[PDB]
Design a protein around this ligand. Sequence first.
Ligand SMILES: COc1ccc(C(OCCN2CCC[C@H](C(=O)O)C2)(c2ccc(OC)cc2)c2ccc(OC)cc2)cc1
Ligand SMILES: [Cl-]
Length: 507
Amino acid sequence: LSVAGEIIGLGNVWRFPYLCYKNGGGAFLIPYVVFFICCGIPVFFLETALGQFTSEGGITCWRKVCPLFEGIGYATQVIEAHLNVYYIIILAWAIFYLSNCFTTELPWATCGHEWNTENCVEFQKLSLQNATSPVMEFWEHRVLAISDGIEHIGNLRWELALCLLAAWTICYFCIWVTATFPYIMLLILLIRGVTLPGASEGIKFYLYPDLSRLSDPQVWVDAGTQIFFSYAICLGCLTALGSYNNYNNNCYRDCIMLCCLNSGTSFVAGFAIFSVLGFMAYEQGVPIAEVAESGPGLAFIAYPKAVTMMPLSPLWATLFFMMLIFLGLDSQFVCVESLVTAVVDMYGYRRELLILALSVISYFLGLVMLTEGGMYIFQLFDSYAASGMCLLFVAIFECICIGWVYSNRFYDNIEDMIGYRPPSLIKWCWMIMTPGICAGIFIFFLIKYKPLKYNNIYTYPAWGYGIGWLMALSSMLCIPLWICITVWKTEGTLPEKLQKLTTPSTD
Ligand SMILES: COc1ccc(C(OCCN2CCC[C@H](C(=O)O)C2)(c2ccc(OC)cc2)c2ccc(OC)cc2)cc1
Ligand SMILES: [Cl-]
């Protein structure tokens, strides 16, 4: 039995270093631990066991167990669709970067190009105020012509538009040895990172928590929700992951590797990246902060520099973007296949040709993020939709059902499935810990919050936060509303009616 490169993906190589550097330093690692043992493994285990016992995923599995709580599935399908639209945008930039890599001299290493301004200094070749770097000018002026403000959307970058079209075609065909390659590249990047001048200075910024700043709830809601973005929890795919098992699989001991090892790659990625930020500081005499960007560009401003600071730069630059593209496509294939499970809901009745309709709709809708100033709407797509509060609230209801509306009986089913009984701490976690911690964090965020800013300079207008609230509600308001559809369509008498909607089916 083996799983190869399953845990490794874009969820810990691109997102985790982004969030760790933005919110702060090593202080972010404390909420990443308390949200891991408690609000982590128990939910993953619950989802996997529920998907394995019922032998079905999506929404019908939640129809069988607590038919009243059928709206959970609809919430997980909408958020998956929201993720599918923008997750492919990241793969467009990698295609563009790989496209102009087949050359003797890398374009993101020298000064004097048309897009470059007069303030660039070609460092490492023989401080100075108002100075920038050539690497950042290949991100802020060439791939994405950033426009001041969200009001001005400007024109559309046609070069990036074609790259997105390729990504869709490559995978519209996906749905008509290897898998060890990413680890080698990660090791190579890590080796070239720690053995650099000033590397140890950056590490202390990463492994020394800065307390007294935990009062801000932003550090507390990004952590935990990042864990939920990883592990693929609350995305409506884990409930189908266990459907392929053989009903006699040791589910508890099964994830203990995946339940833990997937968090063992984020630490190594942080080691590899945060060591580079110390180098750029030792080269420009600047704080460990302000060397790069706090938004979703760090993975495209830190790696290309490390690759440049290495012999045979083009050859290694070609392969890194290849592994990024491969991981992104592999992650997108599964997330696009599950949404087409709408067949079970509508009994595409027989033939699933709606994949073509989904791709065309998703392509045209996603063209907004590729226009001038498209990153500004990207943050609103990543801090409120498919992240932030959209997952915490769903998880509070994820299953107080298994905890209160179904615990002891489920443990009997688990013992029947695997043979023995898991420790009783998980049951108490389900009962009181996860729905308690998540509710506390939710109330903390809603009682005292700070407006979100793009890399801590630019603040969105009122309508940006309005659209963020709209897109966040569009996934969390389905569960309370769906009870009004289920109840009030049955007999009607509340006491007698509540009983039927709660009795599970004949599993
Ligand atoms: C890169 O290649 C893959 C990596 C993980 C997966 C799984 O989720 C994919 C969901 N995506 C959410 C945002 C980005 C995450 C990331 O890219 O990391 C993952 C997966 C899901 C459903 C499956 O059956 C239908 C099978 C696998 C996954 C998730 C967690 C896990 O254990 C922690 C193992 C597999 C699949 C391919
Ligand atoms: Cl993570």
